[PDB]
Amino acid sequence: NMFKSKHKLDFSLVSMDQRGKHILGYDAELVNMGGYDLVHYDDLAYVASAHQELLKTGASGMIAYRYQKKDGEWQWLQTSSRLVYKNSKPDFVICTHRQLMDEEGHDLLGKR
Numbered sequence: 001n002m003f004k005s006k007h008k009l010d011f012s013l014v015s016m017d018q019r020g021k022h023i024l025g026y027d028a029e030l031v032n033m034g035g036y037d038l039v040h041y042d043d044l045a046y047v048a049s050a051h052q053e054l055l056k057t058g059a060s061g062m063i064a065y066r067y068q069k070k071d072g073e074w075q076w077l078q079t080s081s082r083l084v085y086k087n088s089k090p091d092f093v094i095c096t097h098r099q100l101m102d103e104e105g106h107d108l109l110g111k112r
């Protein structure tokens with residue numbers, strides 16, 4: 001139930017596992033989709049704090065949030081993020097996701 005993806009430092013998508021493409025339901029549309037565009041409104045500030053924590057410390061722990069698929073439906077995801085460096089400089093973002101059920105996302109939502 002877990003899949004990986006790679007993003008630029010603005011979290012625009014670069015590549016994604018074929019497992020994740022089947023869940024999200026979007027390859028041609030993957031490069032046109034910048035960051036924070038398909039994240040739920042109630043999660044944008046919390047999700048942006050993980051982006052700040054990623055750039056500040058180099059890693060972001062598992063956080064639960066809602067992402068919109070192609071069908072318009074919201075998907076509960078929990079993602080851990082790590083940085084890839086090019087000579088000590090941050091280069092890309094590597095994310096590890098896990099597809100969650102609605103009850104699983106609600107339980108992790110109540111932990112923050």
Ligand SMILES: O=c1cc(-c2ccccc2)oc2c1ccc1ccccc12
Nearest residue numbers: 005011035036037038039047050051079
């Ligand atoms: O909306 C972006 C896309 C993605 C994303 C996730 C799964 C599939 C495709 C894009 O997630 C994030 C985004 C931006 C900031 C994030 C911070 C922490 C964790 C995830 C973030």
